[PDB]
Design a protein around this ligand. Sequence first.
Ligand SMILES: CNCCN1CCC(c2ccc3[nH]c(-c4ccccc4OC)c(F)c3c2)CC1
Ligand SMILES: CNCCN1CCC(c2ccc3[nH]c(-c4ccccc4OC)c(F)c3c2)CC1
Ligand SMILES: CNCCN1CCC(c2ccc3[nH]c(-c4ccccc4OC)c(F)c3c2)CC1
Ligand SMILES: CNCCN1CCC(c2ccc3[nH]c(-c4ccccc4OC)c(F)c3c2)CC1
Ligand SMILES: Nc1ncnc2c1ncn2[C@@H]1O[C@H](C[C@@H](N)CC[C@H](N)C(=O)O)[C@@H](O)[C@H]1O
Ligand SMILES: Nc1ncnc2c1ncn2[C@@H]1O[C@H](C[C@@H](N)CC[C@H](N)C(=O)O)[C@@H](O)[C@H]1O
Ligand SMILES: Nc1ncnc2c1ncn2[C@@H]1O[C@H](C[C@@H](N)CC[C@H](N)C(=O)O)[C@@H](O)[C@H]1O
Ligand SMILES: Nc1ncnc2c1ncn2[C@@H]1O[C@H](C[C@@H](N)CC[C@H](N)C(=O)O)[C@@H](O)[C@H]1O
Lengths: 343, 343, 343, 343
Amino acid sequence: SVFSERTEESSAVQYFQFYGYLSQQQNMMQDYVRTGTYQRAILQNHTDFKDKIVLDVGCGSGILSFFAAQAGARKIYAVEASTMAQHAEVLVKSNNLTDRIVVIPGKVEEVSLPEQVDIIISEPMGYMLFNERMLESYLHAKKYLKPSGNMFPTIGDVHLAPFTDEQLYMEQFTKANFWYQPSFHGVDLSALRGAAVDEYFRQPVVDTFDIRILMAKSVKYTVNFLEAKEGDLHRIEIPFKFHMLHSGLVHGLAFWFDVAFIGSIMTVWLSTAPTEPLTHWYQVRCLFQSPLFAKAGDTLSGTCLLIANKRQSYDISIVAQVDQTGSKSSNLLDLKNPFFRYT
Amino acid sequence: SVFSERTEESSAVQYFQFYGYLSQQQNMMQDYVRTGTYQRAILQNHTDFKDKIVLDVGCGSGILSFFAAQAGARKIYAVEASTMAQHAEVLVKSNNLTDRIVVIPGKVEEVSLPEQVDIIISEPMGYMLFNERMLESYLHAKKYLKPSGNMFPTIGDVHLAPFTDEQLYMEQFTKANFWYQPSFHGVDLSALRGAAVDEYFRQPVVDTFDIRILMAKSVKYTVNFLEAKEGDLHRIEIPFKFHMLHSGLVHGLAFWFDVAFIGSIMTVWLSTAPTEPLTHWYQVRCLFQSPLFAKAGDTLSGTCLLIANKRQSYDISIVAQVDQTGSKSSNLLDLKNPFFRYT
Amino acid sequence: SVFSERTEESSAVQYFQFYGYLSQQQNMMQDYVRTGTYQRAILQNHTDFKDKIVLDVGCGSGILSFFAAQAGARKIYAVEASTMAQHAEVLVKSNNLTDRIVVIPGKVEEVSLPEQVDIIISEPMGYMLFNERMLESYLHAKKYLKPSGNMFPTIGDVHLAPFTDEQLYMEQFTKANFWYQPSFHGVDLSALRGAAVDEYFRQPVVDTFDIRILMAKSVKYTVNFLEAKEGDLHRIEIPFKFHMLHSGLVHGLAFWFDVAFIGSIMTVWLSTAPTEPLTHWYQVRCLFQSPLFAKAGDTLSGTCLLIANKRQSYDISIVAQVDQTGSKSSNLLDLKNPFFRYT
Amino acid sequence: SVFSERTEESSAVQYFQFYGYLSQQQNMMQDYVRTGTYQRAILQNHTDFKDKIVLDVGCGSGILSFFAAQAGARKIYAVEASTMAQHAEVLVKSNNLTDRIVVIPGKVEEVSLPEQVDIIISEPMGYMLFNERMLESYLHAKKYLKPSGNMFPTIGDVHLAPFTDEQLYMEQFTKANFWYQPSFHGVDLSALRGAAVDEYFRQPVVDTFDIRILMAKSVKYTVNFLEAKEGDLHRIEIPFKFHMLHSGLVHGLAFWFDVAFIGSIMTVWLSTAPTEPLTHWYQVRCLFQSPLFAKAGDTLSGTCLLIANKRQSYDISIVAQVDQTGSKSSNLLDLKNPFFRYT
Ligand SMILES: CNCCN1CCC(c2ccc3[nH]c(-c4ccccc4OC)c(F)c3c2)CC1
Ligand SMILES: CNCCN1CCC(c2ccc3[nH]c(-c4ccccc4OC)c(F)c3c2)CC1
Ligand SMILES: CNCCN1CCC(c2ccc3[nH]c(-c4ccccc4OC)c(F)c3c2)CC1
Ligand SMILES: CNCCN1CCC(c2ccc3[nH]c(-c4ccccc4OC)c(F)c3c2)CC1
Ligand SMILES: Nc1ncnc2c1ncn2[C@@H]1O[C@H](C[C@@H](N)CC[C@H](N)C(=O)O)[C@@H](O)[C@H]1O
Ligand SMILES: Nc1ncnc2c1ncn2[C@@H]1O[C@H](C[C@@H](N)CC[C@H](N)C(=O)O)[C@@H](O)[C@H]1O
Ligand SMILES: Nc1ncnc2c1ncn2[C@@H]1O[C@H](C[C@@H](N)CC[C@H](N)C(=O)O)[C@@H](O)[C@H]1O
Ligand SMILES: Nc1ncnc2c1ncn2[C@@H]1O[C@H](C[C@@H](N)CC[C@H](N)C(=O)O)[C@@H](O)[C@H]1O
């Protein structure tokens, strides 16, 4: 299928195994900012659902389909590829909605829907928005979308901003320097030290932080889900030019994302920004092995390039330079393999 | 090969991917009880290594091979299936031991050794000793062992003992009762509560605990690595009959393990027992979904059956009864998916 | 002379220039622990001075000769090589002691005394006791000492103890990692990092610290000034074996020293130990480029070798290992270029 | 050579020993105003470098030669007399510029260049501009300059202005009054008080200050490096006539300096003025022996005479008088021995 061609088996097996756990579904459900904003977006745009045909891509427990039902949808196809599909079905019966919600087990790239739909709803966002590559399945699902059908969410904004955080940098750096020691139990590791630093700084750091650590206004990259094609997400190039508001060491870029549900009655935003209340997405920071020094008023420019891989994630390339000194930093980060720092 | 036949391709990819991270090797290296006891066991039995031919099964960073070198081995074949084999080679050069340590990339079931060896060393122990099924690879490797060659470690003891821990027990329900609510954003979740309970109880719990929770002297199950065959580990039946030292509710069995390096000069023990300083193996507890009441002097009898699966782990069956009352409990856990509870 | 033989005339120029400043004399005089203890040692041992002939080696302002005069000496030869000799003479006249204190300009190795003395007094101690190599001039002066004449101070103890101090280690490390950066104004410095780390870690660090950072009881090395010869100080080998009292990272050895004035009436001690009030000698710490890990109960053994150079200082060699793991550290330091960190 | 003849070899040893430390090169490199302005001056005047032959006098780490290389120079001879030359060579190789930057170990007065150059670059400025007498080596290098070749920097301005700083003046006596006590542990020290005072006053003070202590617009003395000869710097007479903008006690003269890189495209200024951000040159203050009352509108006139010595520095003679009042003072200062007072 489109899905298996882009996905290593051993990756897909881990992936849907993970979403097969009630405890992981619960973890998403309990993100109240997440779950309550989806519900508001759907219920306050009830005219977008009343008597409509809906597709829920990756329905998990079914929770968004129940919201579509609460908003008056006529029929909701809830597609789910993990064994969580069987639990969703149980909930549909115990909630007496068998006449309106139809669970369809399988990958949205591989199942058959009986008819085209008025609106697709999903929660396909990973870390940094793009992790997991589920946004492609969401876009793929537009093959079932009627002309001028809507998408909920409708657009996604990824934000990047340079940050300073010596304590985080040193913390990762101290980790790598285990492999600097010349006599670990009589053994000289130091020859692997470079490869260690590379491996640790490959990991994006997932947690939250104070906005005070940000040294410039964020740059925004927007994906419009109504318009984008799957292939748009195979290679994502995000150019940036920051105007430094503070002097200091730039330790890397911080990422977060917002999505907007652009309904007929109103637009509702769900934000994972550090100025907003914390969600289970936290935020993400990619460190530089070698931080850049900049002065307030310098411009920091470069590119963040995300290249999709068959492990349902991205290889991240970040090149940045302080234009005023030509100090340049190059980094590649493996998004599939984040360091979850949050405590 | 023997390995590819007992192991799903996708489990193996994830498995050797995991050991490909320097950070994971580092995690094992930094277990000081682990690493220092291996070094002591080897160096204090130097006559077992002096001018010998050695096989290191799953050498990882190479660390144990270097200990064999420090003890005077003539030649060490260090076999390693993950990409960590490349880093090990780097260390062997930078430590100027290319004349004595030979790294051989691949699974010990699939590579060729040039010659038979005097002694096999390995650290193949998972959670509960048996997890990961690397003990089978260690046993398999005996095809390269000279007659009367030795094995380091030489034997492994798994210990089981009943525990009482009301807090751990009730945690499971407090978690699952997330689903016991008639209107979570309007949805009645309650029909999934039993499944959520089942799901948590299927997970063995990894962490340590005060030995005061133990209710009877442990029972011991021993694997002699000089003698055992691979197939002995496909189905491990561990009968038990505990004589209750304390009165209370038994909530499950706790597991830990020791290995002994029985050398020519001395026997060295590595223990992960809760009476001993903590190691990165912690201990493991499997809950009964129905506790059992035993008074001091009663006997709690039953069987712990471990059935190897192709996910490199075991399905655990525990049946237990209080002989004096006849009340019974029986539980299934998946050792491939432990709950890591330690903080 | 013996002095110009062992000293670059260059070094000796700067050295006596330095002591030619009243402000530097003032700096030693104002060390109240230093100056008050000398005065106590001399005045409380007044029988060792009453009607005696005294030599003051390197009299500076003259201060110690005045103490000898206060204790009743008959005649004091006050030898001083810097231009400070002229100011000393001024003080002798204005204090009306021309009949008892006789200033003699010159190096003690190069002047002529009219007669042999009953007692030599001096304050010849540098950082780590030995810096400046003035202890050799003090020993050299014994050519003027009558049989069974005394020396004040009489003995010196150097103390060594291992310490942990991650903040100091990182401070120094962070300095050297400047030479780690790949694009400093567009220039890759990283080739020089090894050499930068070598340079920074050669610098002994002078300042004080809480004794909480010491990980074992100090080892003591004693020089008995009555007995030692000049040449004994050319190459000082200090073997050590620390029984670790705390687990953690050993970042280096800390050094301090005591001298004793063993008089006829009492023995007075001048200590620069970190348990004692601060002197202008502070304490000295030699850092390892990579700390050694150790456990309480381990022994840390090795050698501190001091080799005198013609810059009036020492090249310091420290080799240490953790006996239990064979973990080893070798370091070379440059006592003639200490980093004065105190503030 | 010219260098040896004007320099005591022990001063030279000490001098090039100092620049042999990576930490000292680092200290200049990290002065961002210094290093960034040199880089701007060179890169913004790239036509002055593109395909040119360049001489870097005293290249240190090589940093300026790399800027010349970034601006497109064809060939750069980087001359360096300290052992830093060896580290510069390492950087030239690791930055793959061996085809364009040629390191030449030795004094610029003593080496041979293969050819004449289009432009000399250097950072030869000491405290008060002239300290270290490296400006003469810079001028001496013009023997290798093609006709109408350029010099970067092209001119230097020394600025002098009178300051009032009652606290700084009084601090000299407060320090010297240490000596003014009749019984310091029994000794009358007071006879040395005048010598202490003289000693402190001979030291120019290095630190920065609030510009409000300045009493008059600075007077400027200019060296045009394109025109000046070495000999011009042996005796530098700087007359001054300050038009007092403020009434009060004048305690001395403050010094700072600017240099200009007059390129084909633009002129870039590096300033160490107290109105500008701090550099590692700070500013320099010389006290009068007695303060002079001046009214705003009065004129304070006299001469600052700098006489080069063989310690690579200057004896400074300052004579000043308030023209309207006849009131007069002076001082003699030794620039080799400045007092570093900043914190
Ligand atoms: C789509 N909505 C997700 C909402 N939310 C769920 C929980 C969190 C999360 C974070 C990292 C992850 N890696 C894989 C994965 C597991 C196996 C194989 C490949 C994988 O990703 C590349 C995941 F499922 C996964 C889920 C954060 C995001
Ligand atoms: C043999 N010596 C290891 C010593 N030590 C290493 C770190 C710890 C550990 C714990 C659980 C694990 N599951 C898998 C796994 C990963 C992928 C697929 C299946 C897996 O297990 C069934 C692991 F590697 C793994 C490693 C505890 C034991
Ligand atoms: C003998 N009593 C000393 C008392 N006390 C005085 C002040 C302190 C001190 C510290 C380091 C020093 N290096 C040189 C030096 C200066 C020039 C040339 C070589 C040098 O040392 C290797 C010094 F004078 C000197 C003095 C600490 C000790
Ligand atoms: C040429 N550009 C230098 C830029 N910058 C470097 C660091 C600072 C500085 C200040 C005083 C100094 N005296 C000697 C010296 C050392 C030995 C012998 C005689 C000496 O001075 C006359 C120095 F190196 C030296 C360097 C301030 C200036
Ligand atoms: N190609 C795919 N086909 C079907 N389901 C998928 C696919 N990719 C991911 N999923 C499911 O999408 C879900 C992602 C969750 N973030 C959302 C769950 C649910 N919509 C909620 O809002 O709680 C998981 O249940 C996945 O197993
Ligand atoms: N069948 C196998 N063939 C080769 N290596 C294996 C096999 N199974 C596991 N390994 C490796 O064995 C190692 C197991 C570790 N517990 C030991 C690492 C290392 N010997 C140490 O003591 O630090 C991992 O690096 C695995 O990739
Ligand atoms: N070989 C030498 N001959 C004469 N004086 C020396 C020699 N070496 C060092 N000195 C002087 O000894 C003094 C050392 C000071 N620590 C002591 C000064 C004085 N005794 C006091 O206690 O205040 C300085 O004045 C040195 O210049
Ligand atoms: N006559 C001389 N010949 C060669 N190098 C000299 C001479 N005089 C001084 N130097 C060097 O000039 C350098 C002075 C520094 N201000 C400049 C270093 C470097 N070009 C930079 O700008 O970072 C030191 O490295 C000195 O050793």
